[PDB]
Amino acid sequence: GKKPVKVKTPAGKEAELVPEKVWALAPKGRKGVKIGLFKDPETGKYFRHKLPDDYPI
Amino acid sequence: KKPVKVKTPAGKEAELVPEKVWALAPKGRKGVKIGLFKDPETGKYFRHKLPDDYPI
DNA sequence: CGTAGCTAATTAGCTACG
DNA sequence: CGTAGCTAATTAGCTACG
């Protein structure tokens, strides 16, 4: 079970979505941010967003 | 559009035209003029100092 | 201090083409 | 039709000098 993330949707509302896919966006040598792929349940569209630094990848 | 004599990160010397130029200066100081270059050898970008007379 | 935008990975959502 | 190729969008640290 992948943990849900609290995100402000592109629509505007807040929601506890669970990422379709998770990966680390980082230039070599150092860690960067964690990016999750989300699907807006409302409009059906996709959007990316930063994840908490301690989110399990 | 004027070429600038820069030392590439690759190590070689080249006469390159900067894609983007601007002034990197704090308040009250002159600072420097910075150019955005692209190493033709590797395709890698790098910043470098431009002459103080360069058109910004 | 000060500006500017590349860099990394990922894929949906296009367009393009054979 | 099927497939291949390009971009938008997502972060923050990095680097250039004086």
Swiss-Prot record, chain A:
The keyword Cytoplasm applies. Transmembrane segments: none annotated. It comes from the Archaea. It holds the Pfam family Cren7. The keyword DNA-binding applies. It is found in: Chromosome; Cytoplasm. Changing K39E: Slightly reduces the melting temperature of the protein. Slightly reduces affinity for calf thymus DNA and poly(dA-dT) oligonucleotides. No significant effect on affinity for poly(dG-dC) oligonucleotide. Methylated at multiple sites, to varying extents. GO terms for molecular function: double-stranded DNA binding. One of its GO terms (cellular component) is cytoplasm. The modification N6-methyllysine is found at K13. Keywords: Chromosome, Cytoplasm, DNA-binding, Methylation. Monomer. Belongs to the Cren7 family. A highly abundant chromatin protein, it binds double-stranded DNA without sequence specificity; there is approximately 1 Cren7 molecule for 10-12 bp of DNA. Constrains negative DNA supercoils. Induces DNA compaction and mediates intermolecular DNA bridging. Binding does not require protein methylation. Binds single-stranded DNA weakly. Increases DNA stability against thermal denaturation. Promotes formation of loose nucleoprotein structures with long DNA in the presence of albA proteins. This is Chromatin protein Cren7.
Curated annotation (Swiss-Prot), chain B:
InterPro entries: Cren7_sf (IPR038647), dsDNA-bd_Cren7 (IPR020906). It comes from the Archaea. The modification N6-methyllysine is found at K12. GO terms for cellular component: chromosome; cytoplasm. Transmembrane segments: none annotated. Changing K20E: Slightly reduces the melting temperature of the protein. Slightly reduces affinity for calf thymus DNA and poly(dA-dT) oligonucleotides. Increases affinity for poly(dG-dC) oligonucleotide. Changing K44E: Slightly reduces the melting temperature of the protein. Slightly reduces affinity for calf thymus DNA and poly(dA-dT) oligonucleotides. No significant effect on affinity for poly(dG-dC) oligonucleotide. Changing K38E: Slightly reduces the melting temperature of the protein. Slightly reduces affinity for calf thymus DNA and poly(dA-dT) oligonucleotides. No significant effect on affinity for poly(dG-dC) oligonucleotide. One of its GO terms (molecular function) is double-stranded DNA binding. Monomer. This is Chromatin protein Cren7.
